[PDB]
Amino acid sequence: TCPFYKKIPGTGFTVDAFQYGVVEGCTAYFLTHFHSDHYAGLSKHFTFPVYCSEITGNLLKNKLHVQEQYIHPLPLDTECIVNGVKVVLLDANHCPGAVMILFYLPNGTVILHTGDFRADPSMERSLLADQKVHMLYLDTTYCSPEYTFPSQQEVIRFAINTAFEAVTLNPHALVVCGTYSIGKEKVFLAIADVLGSKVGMSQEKYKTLQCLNIPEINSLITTDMCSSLVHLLPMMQINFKGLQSHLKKCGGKYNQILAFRPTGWTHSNKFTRIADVIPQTKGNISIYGIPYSEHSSYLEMKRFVQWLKPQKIIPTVNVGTWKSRSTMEKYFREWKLEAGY
């Protein structure tokens, strides 16, 4: 059964609610982004309207085979009428095609559902600036002060300079980057660009990348693994066993692997600056864990919410324990008292 925080009161609408069968009263199902926890239950057999971004729509059609007649893509930053209700989609600064959704309820209430997001000051100059929001359904993934990490730009700077230095010292090194879903594409694209290489990968990953509207993509990726010195592999294979095995397959073309595992936050963020990160090493294989986040840090989230000044907040992540829920409610009250709303 569909939980309350995925329902939009006073509409026939649900958000990210595909794993509960036919939801009673739901006339339209919104999908914020193409990550499996959110799309769970969609397939070629789905026969209700789905509303989403153009990119999300390409992925529904090609990867899950959802029939065309049921995919309703909407342009961003544009007031749209869906089943008699005004809605807008805003960029979530998450993975490709991820949106936030503003709902203008018939009774005068305004609701923002962030989906998954990484808050940014640039959001303070979207169509959010124009008016008041009564209810905020908030991505609270890292809603605690210990959750600190660098900007995406600094993390990419570290990876580019690390990769360039290694391959310039040894032209026979191979670079590997881990992946398990869309998002974080800048990691492997930035490294391949500095090295003058295309990124090699499986046919299934190439297919997924081809759905994402990235400019010049045909120039950047390839399924010919042999022509490429940046390879993508599933995240599970980024370990000393999996990388040893991979190196054997390359036919004595390479004599070293430098590999990256983009993670979210890890506890080594509590002690170590990005500059000071070191790899794990075994023989001719090194592995760097790098904290590239597509979710708000604590400070980024607090800034957004204190700017928005919502009347009520409903968390959508970490809602399963009493301790979590209590902790998040304490932070929301501090924020409100500090800012005066």
Residues of this chain that interact with Ni ion (CB under 5 A) are 35, 116
Give 116 or 300: the residue with its C-beta nearer to Ni ion: 116
**Least Cβ distance, residue 294 to Ni ion (angstroms):** 7
Closest separation between CB of residue 35 and Ni ion, Å?
A: 4
Rounded distance, CA 277 to CA 162, Å?
11
Q: Are 23 and 17 in contact (CB under 8 A)?
A: yes
In whole angstroms, what is the distance from residue 56 CA to residue 73 CA? 8
Instruction: Compare residues 101 and 173 and give the one whose CB is closer to Ni ion.
Output: 101
Structure-token pair, residue 229: 């010195």
Pick 118 or 302: Cβ nearer Ni ion: 118
Q: How far is the CB of 42 from Ni ion (least distance, A)?
A: 15
Number of residues in the chain? 341
> Smallest gap, in angstroms, from Cβ of residue 138 to Ni ion?
14
Taking the complex as a whole, the smallest distance from the CB of residue 183 to Ni ion amounts, in Å, to: 7
CB-based contact 336:313 (threshold 8 Å): no
Task: Report, in Å, the least distance between residue 21 CB and Ni ion.
Answer: 23
Buried b (16+ CB within 10 A) or exposed e, 25-51: ebebbbbbbbbeebbeebeeebeebbb
Q: Which is nearer to Ni ion, 141 or 162 (CB)?
A: 141
Residue (64 or 339) nearer to Ni ion, CB: 64
Q: Nearer Cβ to Ni ion, position 34 or 46? A: 34
